[PDB]
Amino acid sequence: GYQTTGENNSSDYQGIIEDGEYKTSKSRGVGISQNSDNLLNLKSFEAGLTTISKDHFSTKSYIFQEGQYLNKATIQDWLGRKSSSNPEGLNPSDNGKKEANKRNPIYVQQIEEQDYMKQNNGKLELAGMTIGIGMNQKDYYQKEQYGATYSTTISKEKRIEEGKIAAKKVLARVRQKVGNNVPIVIAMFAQAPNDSLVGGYFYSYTVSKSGTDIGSWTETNIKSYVLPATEDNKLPNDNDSTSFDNFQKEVKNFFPNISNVTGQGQYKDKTLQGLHITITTQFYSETEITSFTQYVAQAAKSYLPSGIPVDIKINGSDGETQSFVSTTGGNGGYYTHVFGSY
Amino acid sequence: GYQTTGENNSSDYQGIIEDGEYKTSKSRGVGISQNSDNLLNLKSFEAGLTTISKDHFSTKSYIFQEGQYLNKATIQDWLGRKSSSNPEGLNPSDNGKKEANKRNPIYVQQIEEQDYMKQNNGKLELAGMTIGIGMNQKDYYQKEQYGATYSTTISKEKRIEEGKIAAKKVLARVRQKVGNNVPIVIAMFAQAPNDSLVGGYFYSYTVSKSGTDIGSWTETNIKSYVLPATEDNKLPNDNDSTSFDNFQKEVKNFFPNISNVTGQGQYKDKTLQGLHITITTQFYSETEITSFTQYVAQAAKSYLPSGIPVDIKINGSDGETQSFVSTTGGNGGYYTHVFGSY
């Protein structure tokens, strides 16, 4: 039969085990290949789809089911170019043209489904769905076989337009599979370019309560930014940026050997929501790890912006995590853990 | 001047920053080379030296100083064979013999110092010291240049005897450097062999309150054991072993792809004190990580021995830690953290 994973709570969904195995997505793997040139796009797409879901289908009242209605083959077809051989393709036909401004580009890069279930007489019933559609900003391609990479820059306006076109087709198709009564949230994502140190971002969503017409769109403004910031990639808040810089300076030279400090800040508009930081250093003893971990927690509380969740992973040179330091936010909240040897 | 790292507390020592840098050991690095054929010996030696220290020099009343009195060069000399060129060597002279039962073996493999300080008029003063001496069980060596590895098996009796001989020399030498009034704990360790999946163990200690004579020895019995257990390497408690096996079985097949589960159990005599477990699996999405992490916490609470600290690191296939699950012990205590993307 089915059992849940996890307990009922206000932060995460319970998931599903069926017949002794986690009930994996019917499209498992498709996102890896669709994002091969920048896997951070997969990670931010998925993370954002889950937060959008949490805002519409409460973790307290829905169980999360990995998407079952759209399988890998179907998503692969939809992500292909339309042709007489692939009539369901959402991307434009190959007009044969090699010029970046004349070709029909790939507008649609990834699609994921998350299903939200309610319990009915010991059985799960589909009660909500979130669909993400990831749209290219740059579409990379080759003029020749193992040859050089070119790109078509898709304007924000065109991306938005083609996203709405794709959303309407996806909604029509999904409605045939799930029926007319399930609320469906469709969330539009902009893929980061291949050289980006952060994944892409969600820019809008719509909620279809019934039918196939697309109603309003609600614009969204959650974005991630690399740390430390640079002249070309500034944070929305300079004070947060200088705070990070202070933390980095305070940590970097703890040992004779310099420690690398990088991270991401998540913003809603211009307001910092959280920090994720990774420190990488060379440790040569367990007591060095204990001391550094204490000092990182001190430096974080002193110098990093307060009142927000901060997670700091402390890795050795080989990438093995030796400790971590965190606060959920509020105040007096840092926590540490060292993954020591017996 | 000096500042501490960390806050005053009952679980860890505060450490020392001097002139903007952590005050590293004067023998930093020596343990890496002394344990090259099994680095788990370094890790368990250091971890155990810290726990022995905590039992004698309270974390609430001493600051930890990385060993300053014995430098790398001196430890290297002491760990060498005695000769007219190296009169301070603690290991026997090279009698030139190639037969494993005729050669003088290397008895002494590693030495580490930890210093414990009290504050006096804004200055730190040496108030205690722990010295570990690691003794071989098997001593590996070559009869020829880039040639084959042989070993001398050193009996438990001989190891113990030679350990006491080495301890007395180390005590005499250290007393000249630190004076006659500082309590010195000398802790004897047995190196694990080169193929061991666990580091070695502390077998005895003595406390020198003054002078150079070695008093009693107190036998100790903390040991680590690999998980899952095997016919050749059983846990001291079969019920703990079968409990681990149950946990492993319950986790292993969560995904279509099998998950590897290994670990260590720390025992005092025959009584389990704690578990460290590492799970390694292939994740393809952030929702898979959330669900697995919940389920690991459930399985741990259901099936693993209760009333002890358990730490479970959950790694992806590339060794990157994706989440972890822990309880300090007692009851209703599991905690989880997912290192998710924004």
Ligand SMILES: [Mg+2]
């Ligand atoms: Mg320095």
Ligand SMILES: [Mg+2]
């Ligand atoms: Mg299976």
